[PDB]
Amino acid sequence: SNLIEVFVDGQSVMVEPGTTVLQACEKVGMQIPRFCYHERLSVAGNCRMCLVEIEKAPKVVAACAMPVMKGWNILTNSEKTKKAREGVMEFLLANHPLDCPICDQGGECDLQDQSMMFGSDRSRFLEGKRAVEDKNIGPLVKTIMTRCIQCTRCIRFASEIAGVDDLGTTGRGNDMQVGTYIEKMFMSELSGNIIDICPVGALTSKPYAFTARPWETRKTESIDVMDAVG
C-alpha cells in the first residue's frame, strides 16, 4: 500500500500520495475557506485564505497547494490560523466597495459569508479605497470590475475549459485589472458559467440583474431539454 497516514486535529486519516492538505481536510468532512481554489480548475494559490498551520513548523502553508507528507499534523483551528484568516479577510475587505444592497451576489456571496464566519467585525481602514474602470464584455455578463478581488478564476476558466484565451490581468500592483485590454466582446458557448465561479458580485447575469434575491427563491431540480446532453 502506497497510501500514507496524516493527522488532522489529532485524528489519523489515510490519504494518497500527491494529495493536498485541503483534500484531506475535505476527506475528514471539514471545509477550509477559499477564494481561488476550485476542484475543476488549476491551482493558483494567490488568495492566501486557505492558510493553515502544520504543527512544529513556524510558517503557515497554503492548504490548496501544499502536498502532505507522512507524520504531518494539521491544526485547522489554532490561534495563528485564525489570525491569518482574519488578516487575509481584512486585506480583501480593505478596498472592497460598499455595494452590498445594490449587488446581485448579496445573500449568496462567498465574501460576506466567510467574513461573518472567519473574519473580524470592524474595519481599521481609514483611507480612501480604489476605483476600477468598468468594462463591457458582452450582452450576457454584466461587468462591474470595482468589486473584483483578483481571484483569477476568470483567467483559468477562459484558458483551460472554454479555451478562448481572451481574458487577462493588465497592470502591476494594486492597480491590476482583470480584463481584455481592449473592447473585446467575449462570446463563447460556455461564457455564462463564469457567473457561477465569481465569488463576488463583479460578474452577474444581465437578464437576472436587479430582478430577485436568492433567499426568497425556491429551488426545483429539473433536466435541460434544449440540447440532448440531458
Binding site: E79, K83, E86, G119, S120
Partner: protein
C-alpha cells in the same frame, strides 16, 4: 396648582395629607421636549491594536 386657597384647604382637610406639595398633574418641572444632540461613547472593543476576534 391653579386651585383656590379655600378649595386647597378643604381638599387637604378631606384627604388628611398635603396634596399640593406632591401634585399628580405634571407642570413646568418636567424636562423639555427638545434636547441638545448627544455624542454616544464607544464599546470596550473599539480599538486599533490587539483587537483580534479570536481573543
Amino acid at each position: 396648582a391653579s386651585a383656590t386657597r379655600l378649595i386647597q384647604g378643604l381638599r387637604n382637610w378631606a384627604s388628611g395629607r398635603d396634596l399640593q406639595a406632591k401634585l399628580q398633574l405634571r407642570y413646568q418641572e418636567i424636562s423639555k421636549r427638545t434636547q441638545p444632540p448627544p455624542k454616544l461613547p464607544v464599546g470596550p472593543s473599539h480599538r486599533l491594536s490587539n483587537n483580534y476576534y479570536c481573543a
